[PDB]
Structures are given as C-alpha cells and as structure tokens.
Design a protein around this ligand. Sequence first.
Ligand code: FAD
Ligand code: V1X
Length: 460
Amino acid sequence: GGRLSVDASDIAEASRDFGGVARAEPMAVFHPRAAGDVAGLVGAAFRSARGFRVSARGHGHSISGQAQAAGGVVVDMSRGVARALPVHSAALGGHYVDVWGGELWVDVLNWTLSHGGLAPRSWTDYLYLSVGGTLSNAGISGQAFHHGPQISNVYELDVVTGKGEVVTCSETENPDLFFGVLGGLGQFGIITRARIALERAPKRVRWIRALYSNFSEFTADQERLISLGSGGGRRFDYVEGFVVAAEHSSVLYCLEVTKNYDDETAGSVDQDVDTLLGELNFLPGTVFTTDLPYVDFLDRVHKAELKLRAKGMWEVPHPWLNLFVPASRIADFDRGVFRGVLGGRTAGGPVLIYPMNKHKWDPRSSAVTPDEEVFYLVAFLRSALPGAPESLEALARQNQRILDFCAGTGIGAKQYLPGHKARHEWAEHFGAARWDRFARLKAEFDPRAILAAGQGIFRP
Ligand SMILES: *Cc1cc2c(cc1C)nc1c(=O)[nH]c(=O)nc-1n2C[C@H](O)[C@H](O)[C@H](O)COP(=O)(O)OP(=O)(O)OC[C@H]1O[C@@H](n2cnc3c(N)ncnc32)[C@H](O)[C@@H]1O
Ligand SMILES: NC(=O)c1ccc(OC(F)(F)F)cc1NC(=O)Nc1cc(Cl)cc(Cl)c1CCO
C-alpha cells in the first residue's frame, strides 16, 4: 500500500528539523496510505537481521533530531483519503473525532468546525504540528491550566508498536500502552489514530494583554487566574505571559488572557472581562484588547510565521529551550535568568511564562512534570541570526547557563521536549520510579529500540 522514496528533496527534509542543528540522514522515506502500511514497515524492521531505525515524522518541528532515523526509514506521516466525522456519545457526555496520527491540528480544527461547529478544547500555540507528534510530548498552550494538556484530552489511540503490531488502547483497554504512548517521546509505538475530545466551539475571542513591572505581582496574578473555576465560576479561557525588554523595573511582564464567547454569551462578555480584570493588579492604562474570530486567534502564530518567511528569518537555527519550573522557585528564576543570564544587550524571539495545575496532568502518562501542584512553563524561543553560525553558538551557551543555574541552585526544573542524550541525564529527568516504568514499557513494546531512536534514550 505504501511507497519507499529515495528522492533527494524527501531525504533532505527527513534529515533536518525546525532546530536546524541535528542532521542524521535515513536510507529512505516511507509514504504510507493507511495504518497497515506503517505496521508492515515496522514489522519488516523488527524482523530484519540488523533491526534498522524507524521514526515517524509529523511536521518536522523537533528541535534536536527527535524525528530522525540515522540510516533507517523516516515515515512521512503527512497525508495532505476519507476523514471520520465527529461523533456524539451519550456515555462520554460529549463529542470526539478520530484523526490520522499525521494530521495537522490546523486541519483538525477546520474539519471539526465545518462538521457541527466543534473543536478540541486544549491547544498548542502553533497549529502546524501533527496530532501524533504533540501527543508524544504533551501539547501545551494557555488552556492547559483548565483542560490539561492535549494528552489529557484524548480517549483512545491506534498504535503500531515496535513489534509492528496494531493495538487499540484507551484507559479501559491496553491502558499501559495508552498511558505509556502519551508523552512517551515515540518510544513504544507510532500513533496511527487518535480519538480527540471536542466541545462546541466559541465563535469569537476577546484577546487581552496587560503590562506589569513587578514580577511578584505578575506571578501572583497568573497563579490567581489559573485557580478560577470552582462551581463553574467566572474565569478566562486562556492564560499565558511573556517577558519584555524595557524599550520601576528594566524588565516588563506581559499578562495575556482571553475570553471565548458565542452568539448566546456575546452580551455578557464585556461585563465578564471588566469584572475579572478589576480583580487584577496590572499597570493602569496598559490594557490592549482585540476581538477576532476563534480560528484567527488560534492561528496567530502562523501569521507571525508568514512575516518571518517574508524576511528570510524562518529557515534559521532555532535552539529553543522549554522548561517546567516549580512555582516555589519561580521568583529566583526572574533574578537569575530574566535579569541575570538574559540581562543586558543579548543577541531575537519571545520568552513565554505561565503557570499550570499538575492535577490536570494524569500521573499514569509518560509526561514528566515537576513534583509540585503548580508549575510554570518557561519557553525560551530565541532564534539564531540567518547564515551566522556564531549566533547559534552564543544562544547555545546561554541555554547551558540557564540549565547550569537550575542545577546549581537546586531548582527541580524538568525539560519539556527533553534534549538529554546521556543515560544518567535521562535517569535524573525521569527519577527512579518513572525510569523503571519507562524501560519496562520499552522492553515490552520496542525491545529492539527501533522507534524514535533520535530521542537518544535507548540503543539496540
Ligand atoms: C516548530 C514549532 C514547535 C512547537 C511550536 C511552534 C513551532 C514553530 N509550538 C508549540 C506549542 O505551542 N506547544 C507545544 O506543546 N509544542 C509546540 N511546539 C513543539 C511541538 O509540540 C513538537 O515539536 C512535537 O514534536 C510535535 O511536532 P511534530 O508534529 O512536527 O513532530 P516531530 O517533530 O516530527 O516528531 C516528534 C517526536 O515524535 C515522534 N512522532 C512523530 N509523529 C508520531 C506519531 N504519529 N506517533 C508516534 N510518534 C510520532 C517523532 O519520531 C519524534 O520522536
Ligand atoms: N507568542 C507565541 O506563542 C509564539 C510567537 C512566535 C513564535 O515563533 C515562531 F517562530 F513560530 F514564529 C512561536 C510562538 N509560540 C511557540 O512556538 N510556543 C511554543 C513552542 C515550543 Cl517548541 C514549545 C512550547 Cl511549550 C510552546 C508554547 C509556549 O506557550
């Protein structure tokens, strides 16, 4: 059913990622038509004497070669086939939609909106990412504080294991494989189908930004906003934040919130926004508001992408670092990182910061979060200058200084999209109990370590 390709443009693309550093080439790219084709290729690799590497490629958004299969086969999961329609279940209480693992979230959104005006409730900031790719990590944006990450909004999967077997899993059947695959860094199988939870989509968004010069007030407000919702009370539907340079304090903190509304709630949206904002301690006269359709809001980062491609600033190295930081240690992070490591005239990109609630993350999954109820995501999304290798080198040293700071002060930070490569680093990342559950799962579902070897956790 599928097609092996040795096309130079296919090899070149499967040999790079958005990071622009890791460049391990495969022998061929496999283009499947269905799940049985993926099972066939993984089956062949499992049975092969050498046991060649097989890695699924979503949209190639990895930072450090996580989707590369050195001298093996990259499965180009992109499709562009008949799509399953959203379904209502009186047992689950709501809707779901079965999607192909290679499907882009942007295409899922458009499909579910055009079929019942439905949409997933937990997003990523950027929608040109595969479903299987985000579900192998977590899938985070401003909704995770309330709905949990995307791995907390999936009912079932079809997984092609490292033994080339197709398995249907969920909380009730084969749960070990289901929870293992979720946040599992592609280690135990290839997601060929995911059953995404859906809600009735809002039609419009009231998008707000408010400035702060005091980090204690900014963090205190973010932490209060993510605690709202008891008895279905008033709350924002999205809570993010970012660190801004001065051009009271030389560092400004931008709080970013949204209030989702439809035809029925259009009347109460203005009062709801003013009531929630009134309780906050942002700088007076720093409120910036936008009103736009839901799709336009969710697609905001693709618009930033278009501006970058127009300036030759998209195909540049992206040494992006993502950290989860316990809330008990976040104040020290401002002093030491935002003002310290990144202080002064440092040479491009956002630094996002916002808290989340650990209780929205299922502890049975493979995802690694700090051992604290409230933790922040700190996303250093700084890009290197075009055709300037030294720019990448300086950003890499800065990232290592951030990591050294956390280790040196005992901040129990955890890396999201972990870029570790040594066994002792992975053991520390997971901790003893989680490492044991991880390795046991690998022994059962990928004993030959065929899958996602670019993650550099296990070796054949
Ligand atoms: C490039 C980028 C990434 C990004 C983002 C914005 C940009 C410009 N915004 C994000 C956001 O707001 N929130 C978030 O949580 N992540 C965000 N990212 C990162 C993104 O989630 C990751 O890059 C992730 O890997 C998904 O990207 P993609 O779909 O392109 O997947 P990949 O890089 O090729 O693969 C990643 C790993 O998973 C394995 N893999 C891929 N597909 C599958 C399937 N179907 N099943 C199982 N494993 C799979 C790869 O082999 C690799 O190990
Ligand atoms: N403000 C924005 O949201 C954003 C803007 C520009 C952009 O850069 C561009 F090059 F794509 F234009 C990317 C943005 N956001 C983004 O990529 N976020 C992101 C990435 C990873 Cl790798 C990991 C996690 Cl957790 C997150 C989510 C953080 O909230």
